[PDB]
Symmetry: D2
Subunit: 115 residues, 4 copies
């Protein structure tokens, strides 16, 4: 898969397990079209979101459902979701890892891009 998402929990020191991740791709009419979705595993990783054939160039938005995650842990979350927006494959196909580190009132995200 050319697009992996990894999510970590900064409160418990663990991977963020069973976190819903939605990926959208910007359409011609400037609206967000559903592209792919899934849940993080026991390792906090989400593999198999897409394939090389489906992952075309475009502007993508990765929405991480942090609200449900904190609510299920009984913690009061600030953010509705963690939203990462970027242009992908504009200079040819690349592999992307989008990582996110979550806290109730803060999040950090980084990207690892390889050719």
């Amino acid at each position: 898969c050319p697009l992996m998402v990894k999510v970590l929990d900064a409160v418990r020191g663990s991977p963020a397990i069973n976190v819903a991740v939605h990926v959208f791709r910007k359409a011609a009419d400037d609206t967000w079209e559903p592209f792919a979705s899934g849940k993080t595993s026991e390792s906090g990783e989400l593999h198999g979101l897409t394939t090389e054939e489906e992952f075309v160039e475009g502007i993508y938005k990765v929405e991480i459902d942090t609200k449900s995650y904190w609510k299920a842990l009984g913690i009061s979350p600030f953010h509705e979701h963690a939203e990462v927006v970027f242009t992908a494959n504009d200079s040819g196909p690349r592999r992307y890892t989008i990582a996110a580190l979550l806290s109730p009132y803060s999040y950090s995200t980084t990207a690892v891009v390889t050719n």
Copy 2:
């Protein structure tokens, strides 16, 4: 000043100056509607975005135009922007500071809610 935005640059260790910031409030039809906007000052701060009367409870999105900031510096960015989506709840006297720390391929955001 119930809502302030502060933006910092992790590459040069400075405030991020003249960065466009747009604030949206979630409408009844599940759409993002413009609420406030401005450009960060020499201190990387954006004050006077809204008034106590205008800033009601609801779901807000703060979009920071980080792509334009890195491009002006001649540094290649990954993200289109940094978007912070959160619920604003009236739970006593509160002031919100949304702070973002930027790098070309990463960003962190936090909220500081004070009385």
Copy 3:
């Protein structure tokens, strides 16, 4: 005020109040020697740590007692402290703000150097 320390809490979305901060300067015998210290205020800030005359170029270490902070809140922490080690270089008029964002199993630190 050539050196300021600001500490934020990512769990409760607030300044981190009454946190002990110790500043050390690297000696000629490669040892860490005490330089300044204090406790963060109600705003999570610690001002008046040093004077322009005292704050010379060199290698500094800022140690934030995060373990005592989380323990007082009844939250289990991972780190003993958060230590920020950096070189202070005179390159025109400069003020250093060392900011730290804390979670029980994570921390982020940045420096804001302003003229």
Copy 4:
């Protein structure tokens, strides 16, 4: 190995390759005793630092050589090194991943602890 270190570069969007990592363990006389060391691989990971037999309870300090990393990339670093200090195995053996995300004037670190 019960202790893994992963390091990422927030400027280039890549793993931080060939970064020196030194691990110390606090001795009875309050001094830092060398414990283990190594360099991150092409994936930014450092495996095989230690073994279950050698990794006893104690206070450990993981020092990441960020200064050499930025200097070799021709970037001006602020920090001398990224220092992560924590008590390990105090309630029995655990597996620890210490991750760090690097920028020239900032770093973030988190821990993933598993039983």
